[PDB]
Amino acid sequence: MAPSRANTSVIVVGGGGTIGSSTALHLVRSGYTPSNVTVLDAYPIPSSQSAGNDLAKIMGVSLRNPVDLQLALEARQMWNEDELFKKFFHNTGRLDCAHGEKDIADLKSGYQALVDAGLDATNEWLDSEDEILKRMPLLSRDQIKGWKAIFSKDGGWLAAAKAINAVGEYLRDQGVRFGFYGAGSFKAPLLAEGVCIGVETVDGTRYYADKVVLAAGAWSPTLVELHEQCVSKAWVYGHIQLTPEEAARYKNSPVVYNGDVGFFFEPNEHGVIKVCDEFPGFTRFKMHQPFGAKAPKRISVPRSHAKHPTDTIPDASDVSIRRAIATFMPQFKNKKMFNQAMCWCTDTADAALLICEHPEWKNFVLATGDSGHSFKLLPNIGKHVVELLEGTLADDLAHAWRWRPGSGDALKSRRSAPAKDLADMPGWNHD
Ligand SMILES: Cc1cc2nc3c(=O)[nH]c(=O)nc-3n(C[C@H](O)[C@H](O)[C@H](O)COP(=O)(O)OP(=O)(O)OC[C@H]3O[C@@H](n4cnc5c(N)ncnc54)[C@H](O)[C@@H]3O)c2cc1C
Ligand SMILES: [Cl-]
Ligand SMILES: [Cl-]
Ligand SMILES: [Cl-]
Ligand code: NA
Ligand code: NA
Secondary structure, eight states, rough: OOOTOOOEEEEEEETTTTHHHHHHHHHHHHHHGGEEEEEEEESSSOOOOOOOSSSSSSSSOSSHHHHHHHHHHHHHHHHHOTTTTTEEEEOOOOEEEEEEEEHHHHHHHHHHHHHHTTTGGGEEEEEEEEHHHHTTTOOOOOTTTTOOEEETTTTTOOOOOHHHHHHHHHHHHHHHHEEEGGTEEEEEEEEEEEEHHHHHTTOOOEOOOSSEEEOOOOGGGHHBTTTTOOOEEEEEEEEEEEEHHHHHHHTTTTEEEEEETTOOOOTTTTEEEEEEEEOOOOEEEEEEEOBTTTOOOOEEEOOOOOTTTOOOHHHHHHHHHHHHHHHOGGGGEEEEEEEEEEEEEEEESSOOEEEOOTHHHHHHHEEEEOOOGGGGTTTTTHHHHHHHHHTTOOHHHHTTTTOOOOSSSSTTSSSSEEEEEEEEOOOOOOO
């Protein structure tokens, strides 16, 4: 007879990443026996190639629809109040800025949506250079001519690697089982007459459990057949070094974001500032056969920086990140950029998550579709994956997250354009 919580075993594939580690965290917190939880990943938690594993990330701009609202609020509560996560959230505030008549109009209606969702207390509209420089004087009046902004008091950045590592340490201490590398890289579900009973990894190690969760990020559509519900894309970052004097000047600075430029935020403990641009992402299409598809298909397969650490970023991304520096930090415009790299995410057509049982395999549950904006949900997203496993997922979440092949083009998703492909963007490959 099929089990209580204490007797239920769960494998989390990709449990070294954002959604996976959250899932393992909430299994244990909700009272699964730790030894009954297995975390499998290609790399040790925090996984080298996890989009959530770098020294610092920003919370980022919320999406403006009610499910994302509720998730981001859940997350915010936990980043403020959860003893595990609190210490890694740096509540510097955020400026979401815009320039151009269309962009500013969209920013303003976005602002109104926030007011109308009841976030008026923590968001203010800034309608001049002066009001923006008040919130961050270190911005350049020349550069932000005619900018307007939303300032969010609740915004900030996240010691992301440190957070996932704290989760990993907690899982470890509690007695979660780990397999990494050959013993952690998913190859295929184990199936008994149409029902999933485990997974086999690349090196042929077999694991058995009552539930399997595929939280494999950008790799999810490469591992099992998803009929293009998820299309995986790379974004880019670089770093600049500030002197101790400069770093101290920039300390406690808000996150600054502009959708036409990119973002940056305060330097870390080592006086390093991370800079990103904003763009529709890059695919890397090639032939690959997920499991559960008759035949190899052209799909976007991440080019992993962990597998290929000599990779950088396309020349065009160097140019766009440079432009961001020159706009945000004109006085640093000559600083050398280092540790430029790509991180991989996976887009759904509607940019909502894909968290559902796989129609073909009972007890095989997808938890992916992160759509380039889910790191903020590290604290909370696992709770809802567990809910799904337990049949208790709220209706609206289950709906937003449901299986939905053929329901839109994820290559474009909600971005401004279909992603370009790395094959056509020179300068990242240094083999
Ligand atoms: C530059 C950049 C800026 C971003 N900005 C923001 C932001 O401001 N705010 C925000 O909320 N989000 C942001 N995102 C997105 C955020 O990083 C992701 O949405 C989130 O981290 C993805 O979570 P995930 O668990 O789906 O994937 P990941 O964290 O990448 O985890 C997937 C895991 O699966 C593992 N895996 C892969 N293949 C296998 C296999 N065969 N077997 C076992 N395991 C496997 C991987 O090793 C990895 O650990 C940003 C991302 C990038 C790259
Ligand atoms: Cl932010
Ligand atoms: Cl300076
Ligand atoms: Cl490759
Ligand atoms: Na990293
Ligand atoms: Na200034």
